[PDB]
Amino acid sequence: AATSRDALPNTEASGPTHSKEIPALTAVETGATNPLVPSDTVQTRHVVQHRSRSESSIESFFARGACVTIMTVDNPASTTNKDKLFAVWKITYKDTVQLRRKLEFFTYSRFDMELTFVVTANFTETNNGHALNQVYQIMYVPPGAPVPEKWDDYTWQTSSNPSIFYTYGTAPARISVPYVGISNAYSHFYDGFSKVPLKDQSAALGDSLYGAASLNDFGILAVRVVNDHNPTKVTSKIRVYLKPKHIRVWCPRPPRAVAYYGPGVDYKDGTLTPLSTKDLTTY
Amino acid sequence: AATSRDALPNTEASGPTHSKEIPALTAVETGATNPLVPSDTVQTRHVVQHRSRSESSIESFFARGACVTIMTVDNPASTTNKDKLFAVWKITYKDTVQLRRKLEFFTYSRFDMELTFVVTANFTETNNGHALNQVYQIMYVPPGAPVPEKWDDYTWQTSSNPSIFYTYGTAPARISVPYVGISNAYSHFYDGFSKVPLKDQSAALGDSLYGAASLNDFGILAVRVVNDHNPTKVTSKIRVYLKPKHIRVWCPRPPRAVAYYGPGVDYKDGTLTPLSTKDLTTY
Amino acid sequence: TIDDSFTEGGYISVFYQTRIVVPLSTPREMDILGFVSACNDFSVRLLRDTTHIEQKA
Amino acid sequence: NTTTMHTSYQNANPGEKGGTFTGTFTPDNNQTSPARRFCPVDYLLGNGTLLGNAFVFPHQIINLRTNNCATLVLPYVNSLSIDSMVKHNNWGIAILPLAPLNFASESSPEIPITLTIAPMCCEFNGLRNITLPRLQ
Amino acid sequence: ACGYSDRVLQLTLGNSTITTQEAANSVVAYGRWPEYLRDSEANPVDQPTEPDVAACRFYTLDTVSWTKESRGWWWKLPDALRDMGLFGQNMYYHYLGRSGYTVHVQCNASKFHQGALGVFAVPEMCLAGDSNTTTMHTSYQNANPGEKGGTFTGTFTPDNNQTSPARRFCPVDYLLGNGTLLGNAFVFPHQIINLRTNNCATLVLPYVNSLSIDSMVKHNNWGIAILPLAPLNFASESSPEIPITLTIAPMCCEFNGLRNITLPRLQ
Amino acid sequence: ACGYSDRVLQLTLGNSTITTQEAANSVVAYGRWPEYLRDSEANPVDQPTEPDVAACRFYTLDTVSWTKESRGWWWKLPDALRDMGLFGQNMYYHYLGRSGYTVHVQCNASKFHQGALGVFAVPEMCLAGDSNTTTMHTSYQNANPGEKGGTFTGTFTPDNNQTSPARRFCPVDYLLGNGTLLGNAFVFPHQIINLRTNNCATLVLPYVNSLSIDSMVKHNNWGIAILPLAPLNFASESSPEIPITLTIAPMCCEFNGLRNITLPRLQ
Amino acid sequence: QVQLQESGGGSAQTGGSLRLSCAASGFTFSHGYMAWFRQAPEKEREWVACVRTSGVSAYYADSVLGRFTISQDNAKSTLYLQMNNLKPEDTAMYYCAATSISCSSGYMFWGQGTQVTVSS
Amino acid sequence: GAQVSSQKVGAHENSNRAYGGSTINYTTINYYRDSASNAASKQDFSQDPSKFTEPIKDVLIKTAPMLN
Amino acid sequence: GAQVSSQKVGAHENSNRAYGGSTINYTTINYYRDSASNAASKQDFSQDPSKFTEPIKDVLIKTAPMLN
Ligand SMILES: CCCCCCCCCCCCCCCC(=O)O
Ligand SMILES: CCCCCCCCCCCCCCCC(=O)O
């Protein structure tokens, strides 16, 4: 019943003391933190506490949208040699640093996921040519579904896939995705392997990655310019912003101290130094 | 219970007088203002007062939006020598004159703050080139948070910072910020220093500014063009308009007579002359 | 949450009250470990981005 | 005229001897070693505003023919409930002659002014070692 | 009155009994006691096998040594108990398995000895690799070092042989072996054996995972990391040595999907 | 049951807290706790200033040393606290002042150390002179040695320089520094720190005098004398050393007759 | 984009002198201070010297007193650090920390720094 | 949870069967959880300026001699 | 089926005849069938940290000796 926006426990006025009770003495061998408050050690007056923990609630701590990835696509001229650039990105929070570390404060989580799409385009070649306002399809390809090989192949029919046709210039795109995990919680860290190396099998056949569950965990997004070739080249950058809503978490873990290296927990050399120089007897 | 839109006290009909009571005589040594009304000194008729003080209420006096700052950014060509201009402005009402003086009518205040963003762009170089409608991120960097050093560095991920992606051409941008002060009122004037110059310390170590609290009081805003380099240069001006809502104030102070000079109370020479020439016996 | 004079916090110090005494055949020097924790009355506000991590390029 | 908010602590707090107002603003030109003090112009109430508006502050005017003293009880006023006294001054007591001194047909009259202030309802928190400020 | 103390503890599981006279109470991880799967959270449809007394008993892992040189030590559960009586047998015989533990670490000395050992319990204790070229490259054979377990190192030394990698964990001590400052290791349930005070660490651990029941062969639930917070010191000696012994007891263990035995390639 | 002991004591005054694990209970001098002046016994007519938290807190006096050579040590209250924060400030600002104290003497060692220290509290601890020619001749400057205090001597050596006397106390140890046999020193409230047992001495002292309130500058109420009943011994050593630290806390202090500050000639 | 860029090098013999500069841009709201900081090879970052906004009122660190000179040219929007009598203790990295300040400690903008080496 | 408030009619339209007459009201419904977000009510109180006009300890009676 | 919830008033406007005073509320009505689509309520519970602070089997009593 104690909500987030509740006033914190008050400070009780306590006077001088000379008794056989020892708030001050403990033993951190027990693993337990000694739970004291100012009054326990020094004389205090009465204080009606006003501050609340309101903002520090798990839900509020993740209430911000965050850039997960930057997908780049383009629409070149018809005569061109290179193909029209259409991107495919494996949906994961671990491509960027910020949001990841925040999510790493715990062992597991559940959250309905909100994605936002900020598209931004421009020309590239020195020319005064023209491009009419461009549209963009963002097709979510769940694991196993046919990944588009061309920018104009059958896959874009999306008879079952959930897509979003964004018209450039209008407000950023947004879609809601519930907790879609195969487990009873999303796993930030997975101490194990997908395969088991059997003895009646060759090492190769039984080998897999350390820390990985399913290579394809959530699927890929596919983004393409819908409008056809235009004599003047136009490149586009779609920025995805994720805001984890309705979030729950379990078992806290120490926050990442050294820079990330790969999708794993691994650390690169040359970054193994986080704390600076400070003399013990210097304030 | 006497509201803002209340009719003012009526004018009571009072006739001739010849008594030992003296409304007319006072003594402004007491500091107190003699509280009279027409009837006290001259014969009056009865008047049903219609006018109200409605508009003069503290809330209404600040009910206007006001230009606090003009932030300039640009998006130059990829080949260029100079970097893409991205501005960083220290959030303060004292950069402009108007709103400041209004806020200076008192010693302290509390107000939920509304900011509006009016962006306006144009080309610069003589050329007929093209730029597709540009987006703009306005990232609020609270004190201590990582200030962006590049236009494309990690900081723009904004995993915890509150940002606003404005698409050009749509209605001006607006966000609400509550009373975020560290004190129990915002301080317009602070007669004191942040540091104390101790005797067992060097003058340099104990020195600070006069009238300043915390150098970083509210943080900085960071604005950048989101779209990448475009062959034709496009400069942009983001105008911020603040409207202090839900405002309270305390202790009135004489309004600024001479032009402002710096963030302080200080006055420059050559501006020490506000009142003009008028002869004592000339209407 | 940053170094500031206006919002300074003070000083935490540790001094020998008496001294450390050990009998013979005993390590004459040892260690002390320090811990810190907020109290029930503690709170934090105005969410912001941290500097204790970054992504260079 | 070169450095805003530059008055040094030692000049900001002139203790019991206090300070004065001046009839003219004279900039400090020695940029080799600034004087770093307040130059509070009288008519500007020493803060860029016309003296005539000084009445918005609680006040009394000792007008010789009438009274002989001014008593102004002041409550604690600040943005915080309690604050560092060493660093910050709550109130300010400014005395300026609205009407110049005149006595008989004399050229040099003189009369003294004495200030007696009494702290009230004072409370202090966070007891520690004594601060020896650098006042000079 | 009768003399009941926090230091004196007698734990009993099955046919094994652990005693102690210098304890520091006991730790129930996240306050939850280990338990059997409730119909509400059930997942596999078959009748689960609960070995009970057969597997719910203390098993002593070979004893390691502690010297001034020691950086650290680590194990994985259920991994560590992969070859402990019926628990292992049952483990290898089923596709799924969930188990909790009563971890008791034993390390005594004299009132003339000094130091501190922090036995930490980390659910999903992922450790870091040894290559600056290949992320997440530690091979299964090095990920699961059984009852002998592993250690922590004082320096990160990259593996350069790209002709045949060493594919192991190089878990830097101060980084708790996972890129985070050790000082924060207390967020995990824990006890610190500080010689002058106690002589043992008891950490009861409930089953913790993202799933109700999971493949034990493939995945380790908990992690037991022991690193000397205070280095070992004894008298005016240059080479002191005292042993550390780990005895872990699986609790409320249940296994589903009975099939032929898995003979893993451990070497 | 819960483990409450006589040895474990936590005292708190204002913003200071004293703990201890090897105490021998505590002494309330003459059973009376220090208290504020009651209207029944009031004397000065003005509103007394009661500094409370401002002065009622523990103040540590510089630490002295204990060796086999040590004869003794002594202090005077309020004298000893003449330069301790606000208590001193207030002391110097008033003509009258009454205060009680919570004297805590700290001196720990090893179970291998041996000796006993008798911390005695003597109200009106008058000490003897050093001249065989002039009685009651000790000068104020020598009567009040502040926080550094004084010592006892093993032999009485008269002062012969009658050209310029030394005018100090020569307090013979066995004579308790006042012409009486030490063995009778127990009639005063006291505790004896006997190394093998305890580690501290706590003597709460109420205001004791012939007047309800008195000039603190001029007169000392109590006296804290510490003399080794059993000499210091450690191992088979020739020069052992252990420190003694005094922390005193004024209690229920009240001052009357506020005036300008007194700058005494202490040197 | 308050661009603070140091210059001045660092490879002099023991006893010489170097001119450490710093190009400033963006919006340096004059009022406040502008300064210099050193990190040293293996020590804590230490304050060198601070000069006032436009005012040539400054201070120096006890260690560097008189041997370092910090000025400015607000026309050229630059600050300068002349350093005479370089020594083995002065060998270190130097940073132009010129923003906000108000004193000799607060900042929102630093530079990339440059290394100095007084060899002998 | 709509907030219906009345308006101070100024220019009266030739109506008392819709406008002009029968008290004109307006509806308001907040759209956000934060108090900061709300629209400025404008239904504020006024007060006695005596706290500034008569900062005297003994009550000011206009009809009598100020200094008595 | 509107959801009316109250707000924790921070900066009080000079009103108690519309704002400031008489408890400020806000309306919310879901627009989709999916729970995922809803706006984040923010009316969340807090709890006892003892599950982390005191992970001990026998209750921790601050006033007594830890190890008894
Ligand atoms: C139109 C998009 C529809 C569906 C999008 C599916 C992407 C889901 C991404 C969820 C990320 C949760 C990460 C937790 C990792 C884990 O489960 O172990
Ligand atoms: C997205 C922007 C979020 C936060 C913006 C914070 C800026 C707050 C500015 C408040 C100005 C109040 C000025 C009063 C001065 C004072 O407190 O002394």
Q: Whose CA is nearest to atom 8 of ligand 2?
A: B218
How far apart (Å, rounded) are the C-alpha atoms in residues E101 and E251? 5
Q: Is the CB of A99 under 6 A from ligand 1?
A: no
The CA distance from B83 to the nearest CA of chain H, in Å, is: 37
Inter-chain touch F102–A20, beta carbons under 8 Å: no
Of all residues in chain A, the one with the smallest CA distance to F12 is A17
Whether residue F128 contacts residue F175, with contact meaning beta carbons closer than 8 Å, is answered with yes
G52: which strand partners?
A: G33
A176: which strand partners?
A: A114
Q: Give me ligand 2 centre to Cα B92, in Å.
A: 7
The CA distance from B97 to the nearest CA of chain G, in Å, is: 16
Q: Judge whether A209 is closer than 8 Å to chain E, CB to CB.
A: yes
Which is nearest to A222 in space by CA: A158, A177, A178?
A158
DSSP chain A: --BTTPBPPPBPPB--EEES--SS---TTSSPPP---GGGTS-B--B----B-GGGSHHHHT-S-EEEEEEEEEE--TT-SSPPP-EEEE--GGGSSHHHHHHTTEEEEEEEEEEEEEEEEEE-SSS-------EEEEEEE-TTSPPPSSSSSGGGG-SSS-EEEEETTSSPEEEEE----SSSSEES---B-SS--BTTS-TTTT---SS-S-SSSS-EEEEEE-S---SS-EEEEEEEEEEEEEEEEEEE-PPP-S---SSSS---TT----S----TT--
Strands (E), E78-208: 94-106, 113-121, 150-152, 190-194, 200-205
Tokens standing for residue G43: 């020590």
Residues 6+ apart with CB under 8 A from B249: B58, B105, B106, B107, B108, B109
DSSP chain D: ---TT---HHHH--GGG----BSS-------SS-------BTTTTTTTS-GGGGGGSS-----TTT-S---------SSSSS--TTTB---------SS----TT-S-------------S-------SPP-B---
> Other CB atoms closer than 10 Å to residue B86's CB: what's the count?
24
Q: Whose CA is nearest to atom 13 of ligand 2?
A: B186
Subunits with 3+ Cβ pairs within 8 Å of F are: A, C, D, I
Whether residue D94 contacts residue D46, with contact meaning beta carbons closer than 8 Å, is answered with yes
Single-letter amino acid, residue E106: Q
Q: Which domain holds residue A166?
A: 1-283
> Other CB atoms closer than 10 Å to residue B278's CB: what's the count?
7
Q: Which of A68, A186, A188, A194 to mutate to test the pocket of ligand 1 (most atoms within 8 A of CB)?
A: A186
- Strands F10-13 and F150-152: what pairing? unpaired
Establish whether chain E is in contact with chain G, requiring a minimum of 3 CB pairs below 8 angstroms.
no
Resolution of the deposited coordinates, in angstroms? 4.7
Residues 6+ apart with CB under 8 A from G86: G12, G14, G15, G16, G17, G18, G67, G116, G118
Residues 6+ apart with CB under 8 A from B166: B117, B119, B135, B136, B137, B138, B173
Q: Give me ligand 2 centre to Cα B192, in Å.
A: 20
Whether residue B242 contacts residue B114, with contact meaning beta carbons closer than 8 Å, is answered with yes
Number of domains in chain I: 1
- Strands G33-38 and G92-97: what pairing? antiparallel
Of all residues in chain I, the one with the smallest CA distance to B246 is I13
Whether residue B249 contacts residue B58, with contact meaning beta carbons closer than 8 Å, is answered with yes
Burial of A279 (0-12, 13-18, 19+ CB in 10 A): exposed
Q: What is the DSSP letter of B262?
A: S
How far apart (Å, rounded) are the C-alpha atoms in residues G70 and G94? 13
How far apart (Å, rounded) are the C-alpha atoms in residues A260 and A253? 16
Q: Which residue has the tokens 């309800």?
A: F212
Alpha helices in chain I (DSSP H): 50-53
Which of H5-40 are b and which e, b meaning 16 or more Cβ less than 10 Å from the residue's Cβ?
Answer: eeeeeeeeeeeeeeeeeeeeeeeeebeebbbbbbeb
Q: Which of B217, B221, B243, B248 to mutate to test the pocket of ligand 2 (most atoms within 8 A of CB)?
A: B217
Tokens standing for residue A46: 């009465």
Establish whether chain E is in contact with chain A, requiring a minimum of 3 CB pairs below 8 angstroms.
yes
Which of I30-65 are b and which e, b meaning 16 or more Cβ less than 10 Å from the residue's Cβ?
Answer: eeeeeebeeebebeeebeeeeebebbbbeebebebb
Tokens standing for residue E230: 């205070």
Phi, psi of E19 (to 5 degrees): -115, 175
Q: Is the CB of B182 under 6 A from ligand 2?
A: no
> Rg for chain I (alpha carbons), in Å?
22
Residues 6+ apart with CB under 8 A from G47: B204, G35, G36, G37, G61, G104, G105
How far apart (Å, rounded) are the C-alpha atoms in residues I51 and F78? 50
| Side-by-side strand order, sheet with F10-13 | A17-19, F10-13, F16-18
Q: For residue B213, give the nearest of C6, C49, C50 by CB distance.
A: C6
| C49, D65, D103 from D108: Cα distances, Å | 68, 19, 8
G84: which strand partners?
A: G17
Which is nearest to E36 in space by CA: E202, E209, E252?
E252
DSSP helix, strand, coil percent of chain E (3-state; round to 5)? 10, 35, 55
- Count of positions (residues) in chain D: 136
Inter-chain touch C4–G106, beta carbons under 8 Å: yes
Q: Which domain holds residue I44?
A: 1-68
> Other CB atoms closer than 10 Å to residue E32's CB: what's the count?
15
- What residues of chain E lie within 8 A of the CB of C28, using their CB? 236
Which of A67-101 are b and which e, b meaning 16 or more Cβ less than 10 Å from the residue's Cβ?
Answer: bbbbbebbbbeeeeeeebbbbbbebebbbbbbbbb
> Other CB atoms closer than 10 Å to residue E47's CB: what's the count?
8
Q: What is the DSSP letter of E172?
A: B
Tokens standing for residue A118: 């900020």
How far apart (Å, rounded) are the C-alpha atoms in residues E9 and B274? 87
Residues 6+ apart with CB under 8 A from A75: A84, A131, A134, A225, A227, A228, A229, A230, A233, A234, A235, A236
Number of domains in chain A: 1
Q: What is the DSSP letter of B206?
A: T
How far apart (Å, rounded) are the C-alpha atoms in residues F44 and F50? 14
- Strands A186-187 and A106-123: what pairing? antiparallel
Burial of E77 (0-12, 13-18, 19+ CB in 10 A): buried
G82: which strand partners?
A: G19, G69
The C-alpha angle with vertex B256 and arms to B254 and B258, in degrees rounded to 5, equals 135
Q: Is F122 left (phi over 0), alpha (psi -120 to 50) or beta?
A: beta
Inter-chain touch I61–F2, beta carbons under 8 Å: yes
How far apart (Å, rounded) are the C-alpha atoms in residues F45 and F50? 15
State the SS3 of chain F. CCCCCCCCCEEEECCEEECCCCCCCCEEHHHCCCCCCCCCCCCCCCCCECCHHHCCCCEECCCEEECCCCCEEEEEECHHHCCCHHHHHHHHHEEEEEEEEEEEEECCCCCCEEEEEEEEECCCCCCCECCCCCCCCCCHHHHCCHHHCEEEECCCCCCCCCCCCCCCECCECCCCCCCCCHHHHHHCCEEEEECCCCCEEEEEECCCCCCCCECCCCCCCEEEEEEEEEEEEECCCCCCCEEEEEEEEEEEEEEEEECCCCCCCCC
Burial of F119 (0-12, 13-18, 19+ CB in 10 A): buried
Single-letter amino acid, residue F230: A
DSSP H or E stretch at residue E86: helix E85-93
Residue A107 belongs to domain with CATH number: 2.60.120.20
- What residues of chain D lie within 8 A of the CB of G57, using their CB? 3, 6, 31, 33-34, 36
Q: Is the CB of A140 under 6 A from ligand 1?
A: yes
Q: Which fold has domain E1-267?
A: Jelly Rolls (2.60.120)
Q: Give me ligand 2 centre to Cα B90, in Å.
A: 10
Residues 6+ apart with CB under 8 A from B160: A64, A98, A102, B145, C47, C48, C49, C50
Determination approach:
cryo-EM
Q: Whose CA is nearest to atom 14 of ligand 1?
A: A186
How far apart (Å, rounded) are the C-alpha atoms in residues A137 and B246? 44
Single-letter amino acid, residue B130: H
- Count of positions (residues) in chain F: 267
Inter-chain touch A18–F21, beta carbons under 8 Å: no
Q: Which ligand is nearest to the CA of B160?
A: 2
* Side-chain half-sphere CA neighbours of F263 within 13 A: 0
Distance of CA D117 to the CA centre of its chain: 13
Of all residues in chain F, the one with the smallest CA distance to D131 is F85
Task: Parse chain F into domains and list their residue ranges.
Answer: 1-267
Single-letter amino acid, residue D63: N
Subunits with 3+ Cβ pairs within 8 Å of H are: B, D, I
Q: Which ligand is nearest to the CA of A138?
A: 1
Which of B235-262 are b and which e, b meaning 16 or more Cβ less than 10 Å from the residue's Cβ?
Answer: bbebebbbbbbbbbbeeebbebbbebbb
- What residues of chain B lie within 8 A of the CB of C10, using their CB? none
DSSP H or E stretch at residue G35: strand G33-38
Q: Give me ligand 1 centre to Cα A90, in Å.
A: 10
Which is nearest to G18 in space by CA: G63, G70, G54, G89?
G70
Whether residue G70 contacts residue G77, with contact meaning beta carbons closer than 8 Å, is answered with no
How far apart (Å, rounded) are the C-alpha atoms in residues E31 and A89? 41
Mutate: best of E25, E40, E136, partner A, most A CBs <10 A: E136
How far apart (Å, rounded) are the C-alpha atoms in residues B249 and B58? 8
Q: Which residue has the tokens 């005094």?
A: F246
Which is nearest to G95 in space by CA: G38, G32, G45?
G38
Q: Is the CB of A187 under 6 A from ligand 1?
A: yes
Inter-chain touch G57–D3, beta carbons under 8 Å: yes
- Strands A66-75 and I25-28: what pairing? unpaired
Q: Which atom of ligand 2 is nearest to the CA of B164?
A: 1
Q: What is the dihedral of CA B206, B207, B211, B214, to 10 degrees?
A: -70
DSSP H2-66: -EEEE----S--S-SSSSSSS--EEEE---SSSGGGS------B---THHHH---SS---TTS-S
Of all residues in chain I, the one with the smallest CA distance to E4 is I68
> Other CB atoms closer than 10 Å to residue B150's CB: what's the count?
14
> Other CB atoms closer than 10 Å to residue B18's CB: what's the count?
4
How far apart (Å, rounded) are the C-alpha atoms in residues E267 and G46? 54
Phi, psi of A114 (to 5 degrees): -105, 130
The CA distance from I45 to the nearest CA of chain E, in Å, is: 19
How far apart (Å, rounded) are the C-alpha atoms in residues F266 and B121? 79
Q: Which of B89, B186, B189, B216 to mutate to test the pocket of ligand 2 (most atoms within 8 A of CB)?
A: B186
Q: Is the CB of A139 under 6 A from ligand 1?
A: no
Residue H49 belongs to domain with CATH number: 4.10.80.10
Q: Is the CB of A113 under 6 A from ligand 1?
A: yes
Residues of chain B contacting A, Cβ within 8 Å = 127-135, 154, 156-162, 165, 167, 169-170, 226-231
Q: Give me ligand 1 centre to Cα A218, in Å.
A: 5
Whether residue A63 contacts residue A111, with contact meaning beta carbons closer than 8 Å, is answered with no
Phi, psi of F2 (to 5 degrees): -85, -10
Q: Whose CA is nearest to atom 9 of ligand 1?
A: A218
How far apart (Å, rounded) are the C-alpha atoms in residues F42 and F38? 6
Q: Give me ligand 2 centre to Cα B181, in Å.
A: 7
How far apart (Å, rounded) are the C-alpha atoms in residues A194 and A216? 12
CB interface of F with D, residues 82-121, below 8 Å? 85-86
Q: Which residue has the tokens 């580690």?
A: F199
- What residues of chain G lie within 8 A of the CB of B208, using their CB? 102-103
How far apart (Å, rounded) are the C-alpha atoms in residues B147 and B158? 11
- What residues of chain D lie within 8 A of the CB of B253, using their CB? 49, 56-57
Q: Give me ligand 2 centre to Cα H53, in Å.
A: 33
How far apart (Å, rounded) are the C-alpha atoms in residues A8 and C42? 8
Longest C-alpha distance within chain I, in Å? 61
| E153, F71, F176 from F181: Cα distances, Å | 67, 15, 6
How far apart (Å, rounded) are the C-alpha atoms in residues B136 and A118? 10
Q: What is the DSSP letter of G76?
A: T
Tokens standing for residue F2: 């819960």
